[PDB]
Amino acid sequence: TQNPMVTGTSVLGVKFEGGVVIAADMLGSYGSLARFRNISRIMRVNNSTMLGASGDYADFQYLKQVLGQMVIDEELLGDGHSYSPRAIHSWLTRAMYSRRSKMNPLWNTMVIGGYADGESFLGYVDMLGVAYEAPSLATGYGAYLAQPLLREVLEKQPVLSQTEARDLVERCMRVLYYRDARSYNRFQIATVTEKGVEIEGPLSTETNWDIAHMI
Amino acid sequence: RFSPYVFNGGTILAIAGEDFAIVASDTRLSEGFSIHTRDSPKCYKLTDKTVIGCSGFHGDCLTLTKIIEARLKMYKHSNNKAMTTGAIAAMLSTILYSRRFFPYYVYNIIGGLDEEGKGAVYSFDPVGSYQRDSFKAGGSASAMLQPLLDNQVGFKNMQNVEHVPLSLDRAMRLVKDVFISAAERDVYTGDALRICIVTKEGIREETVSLRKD
């Protein structure tokens, strides 16, 4: 892919006590025009791991097609095994690195959240095959904006509960509405626990405009 | 249009001792004017006597590490033994040249013990030429570390100073002093210091914090 037509925007993610929460908006902009106001940018993988992505959306439907097939292909065996969230992070990195070596890359930036064996997982995948782990992730302009808010709280307090983490994401998703030109005031929140993958509905923000009455 | 390369920073240091080898690196991963993480060490325990360091483009560092670890198993079941330190440096030179016209953007330093029990440090280039040295410093802060180690380890430009070999304890504080001075003037260096010590009794690790800016 040389020219990304329909792109997304920033995707957030942070660990807490026994789970990982990931949020992103629902916008399908083409350049400056917001052509698609209602799309889903978070994919629920089987029971423990979970994927949200940025970049080109037509490439995301391709990886939604392939990852959806591989999970079905193991469940039909029924041998009591499944893909760990780290194994999805390993496969996806080799898929992106082998794709850029042919000089025909996939225009994406992907965040993998997972919870298995009582352990949280939060992985980053770049277009260029750059991958790492972190207690908090942010893509796009969110790495400039929400990422200083993430690292500030996690250094003053290393562990977080679920209600502390979910309230902190809504503060950062509020901020990106003010100064990202490709933001959208309707987003959804996905969360893994020991109970499984759960995706909340199209939530909205609460804005302040009291500085408009100033000169 | 699409460009396949990007710079990620990093600094790798190796010192060949008389009966030891010390490999040190920082854990800061950056790109452009952003910090991805503050915990990403560059040390990789290949065998019980060989540690490799990989700087440069991070996507090639993850690929090249897994290729070498596959060929370690491919050597062993074909030969009923493990590779030496010099055998890995001979194998790595053929792998780096195998993509001569689309090169890895990785600077490599291999440090470890030979078959006689002495230190050995091999430095590399992104195309695959190598030589055995006593101390090298690769990465973004490579120019800020080579002149100081010429004064202290190599005893260059000194008068009326005996050539005592570097002990283990004296070598530890030389590593801890160069990364403090390098993190001041370089922006791609900080947040930790992972140190691996390779002796005849195994591999030790040690972490020293740096400034977090």
Next chain:
Amino acid sequence: NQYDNDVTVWSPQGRIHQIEYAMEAVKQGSATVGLKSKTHAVLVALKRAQSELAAHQKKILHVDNHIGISIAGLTADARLLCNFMRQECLDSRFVFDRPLPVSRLVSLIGSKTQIPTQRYGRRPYGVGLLIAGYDDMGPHIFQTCPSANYFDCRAMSIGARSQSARTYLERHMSEFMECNLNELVKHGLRALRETLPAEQDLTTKNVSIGIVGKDLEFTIYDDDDVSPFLEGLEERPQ
């Protein structure tokens, strides 16, 4: 007798004789016994000398850090399946960064050996692989056959005169789940000593024992480290 020539040709009784003959090549090799507990799976083989002063031919060979196999049958088909076995083990390490589940690796072998049992131009693989391993759900003991069937089991003995070893395993299989390695290994090598002619004894130079454990990597002991295992044994009731 005219139906007894190719793999493709069916019989008027419905039995392909070339698959039935590759079972007979398994009985040429020596005996080997594998078994498992809740935590530990141990397979024990029996070496055979070629001459009076050559080295004994090895049976147990390492595959992965959690998989080791035994052998019975043709040595040509032995190393040909081993090179296919080692290639699949490191591909999951390179791609998925996880070790293989043992139950799905053997399904790749049955797909591998199925083509030369149907298409003309290649004989079936005369081989008697016993497989021990560790997936996330404990130890396993597997066997294969040149008819491309693979059998999960808790104890198995194949090779020359291995029927007498099976009779020992059936009347002691209730004891195998609880006992640990100090006797679980010498539960197994009491089964090999009925697959011997009654005048010679299982020495230290003709036996191999391979142990893979829940917290233990697969390790092959032979000819020097068998002596802590052969201590504390009774003789045959002669």
Next chain:
Amino acid sequence: YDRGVNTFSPEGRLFQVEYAIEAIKLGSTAIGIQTSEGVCLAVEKRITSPLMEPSSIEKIVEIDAHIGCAMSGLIADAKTLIDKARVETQNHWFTYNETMTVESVTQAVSNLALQFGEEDSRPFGVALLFGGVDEKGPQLFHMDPSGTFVQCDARAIGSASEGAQSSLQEVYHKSMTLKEAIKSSLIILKQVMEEKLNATNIELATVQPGQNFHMFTKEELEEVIKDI
């Protein structure tokens, strides 16, 4: 069912490779002995004509500067096996800066002898003796057309193979020396060949740890025979 490499027997077996073992029997004898001081090696020439040039008959070839060789059986298939055995030791030094061990030489050799009908031809007709001093000391190995590979302490193959083995198992022990094993080897040779043993019927080849050169004896062989 005894004319095909793609066909089993009701009992085992082949019935094709078994016939390839028989092709070794009409060769010439060759004896190699492993000793802690090094590996000696002997062979019989069977020169037919005086006009026949003697050094064009090879039985010991130099695989590498620390590994010798010996052969019997079909000469035509032997030159194919010696070729890659020189190349595989050379490819290994190119990519590892080290000498390939004597055991792992034959691993590369046996990987092609078991390819006669197992691609996607006939098996070979030659047995080989490999002697060499690697990092595990002196070694002596043996292979066959069936790819079955094994280590031997003292081995005699070719014609007069079984008759040599019975006398060779009598005098071998662990605490031999090299100069004792050389004169012990050709006592066996003059008892198994039909011509009178002289300096033109046989040839020797040794290898030592510090003397990795000299896989040949050049008319010092006359000194050994005259003191039999």
Next chain:
Amino acid sequence: TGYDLSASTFSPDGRVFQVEYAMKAVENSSTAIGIRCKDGVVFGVEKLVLSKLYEEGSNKRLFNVDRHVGMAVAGLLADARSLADIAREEASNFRSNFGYNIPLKHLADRVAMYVHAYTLYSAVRPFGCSFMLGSYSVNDGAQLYMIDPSGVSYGYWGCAIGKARQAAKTEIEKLQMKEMTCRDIVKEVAKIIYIVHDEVKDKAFELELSWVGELTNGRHEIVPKDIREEAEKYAKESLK
């Protein structure tokens, strides 16, 4: 007979015996039956224990092709494993090219044409397997299919594959299967197995029951009749 070597040759009266020879190799396998109710399909396989060292669930003959499709093979077990992987691979390409689940009427056509191709050339032999295909949908209901080694594939309400192919379908057809629910079918399948030669001249056996329909919401899985064990409790009362 001599004129029966290749699969690409005809007899002087006009049939291929290599297909005829492979059909009665399925005859020597144990009996596996299939039946469908008005809102589901219930499988059932008589499977015998080899000696004793079988580990209670190995080498099963109830496969799982798709999310809603499974098999009930009988015959050469290794030949059925390679044939099951074709149907797994065939249903994946229909998903990747059309975006929805494979219909069972189209799936059985793709498999039977693949079995047909091994009955034409002298290089390969025909298969030695016969099997069942059961599925359930909300727009199509429940279907049940049947594939011989020759490649003839069409639909039944009930079937049997094994030794007792005739001896099982005698008492299948005396059931009012058009209106029963597939929970009442499960206790009725188990008596059909235990009437005809479960361990009479054989040694031992173990019953397997697969299960798909409206109660599983289209899923295909094994029965929970390890829970409450009701199949054997109801079928062993038919001793007199």
Next chain:
Amino acid sequence: TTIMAVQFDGGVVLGADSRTTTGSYIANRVTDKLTPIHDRIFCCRSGSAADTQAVADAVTYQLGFHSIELNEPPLVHTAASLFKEMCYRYREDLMAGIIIAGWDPQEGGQVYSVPMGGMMVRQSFAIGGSGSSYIYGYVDATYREGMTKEECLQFTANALALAMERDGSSGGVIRLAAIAESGVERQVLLG
């Protein structure tokens, strides 16, 4: 070029201009911008003319062959998947603006949108083409959930005529089509 698709309770309503231009010269003055694939499934095309005509022939070949095997009427979502498998695969080679709409017995009226990228999404109404940027503010202030068929024919007629007001790649004549369970009603509007 401006194309339009609105679903309602019964089925869908399609509409397009004609005016196939090149540079600033109209080559074709009246043009069938909407193309039959099956008896119930249409598509309206935008982008390069030679690219979209080649794709619409191959999909009609593949879907027309596929429904005869099943002996069933095809799904509208099945047809929209086939355009995705060619536009995403042969990207950097084609410029296609395909919008797929039609009635289906299982689901009723459906409208899918496949832009120049290669993605696929279901929508209530869909616009496309070069002149579609000018009516994006009109089409969402006028749309109302729960229209009849005659309202949607009135809706797309006023919606196209504003893009067909003067804009140089648009105008000409209005071709409308209504697809329902009964049949397909096609008409040409002028004046």
Next chain:
Amino acid sequence: TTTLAFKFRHGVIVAADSRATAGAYIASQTVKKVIEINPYLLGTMAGGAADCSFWERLLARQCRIYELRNKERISVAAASKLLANMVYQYKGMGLSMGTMICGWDKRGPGLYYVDSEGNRISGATFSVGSGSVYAYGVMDRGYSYDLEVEQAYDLARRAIYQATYRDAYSGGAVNLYHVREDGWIRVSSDNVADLHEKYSG
């Protein structure tokens, strides 16, 4: 980078520097730029580090097989020709290689020059490198075919020192080899700063 080679009555003299840079940054000072191919052949490194390192190692892989198949050493003209054909297949793709081939032969001495462009020429004197042009003048002023052995050692040691003086990309140590009839022999290895106290004094 500065290498030179010249043959005379008593064999061939090979000398080189030891400095390898990276832009304006000196990487090392102990680079061995004379690659020991065989006990009877020598090769140089001039232009490209891994390019001269790989293909001469591949040439040493080839000359050993030629010795085993034919029971005889390879000639000097044979090895320079085999190196020329391997590099010519990658012409235009961007290789850099300017090495020299030295060794004794049955015809006597041997000295050939191989480029990455495809130039294979013989000769008596050569000097390759960035500071090579500073070494031609001081060598040819003192060159003779009938020089002594100790005189030829001092000529090549002088010529590398004058090249490292004017050039910025040349320095470190001065290696010096001597090709005799039986095989090559390492003469010495001297620092430039030690020669500066000797020559200027």
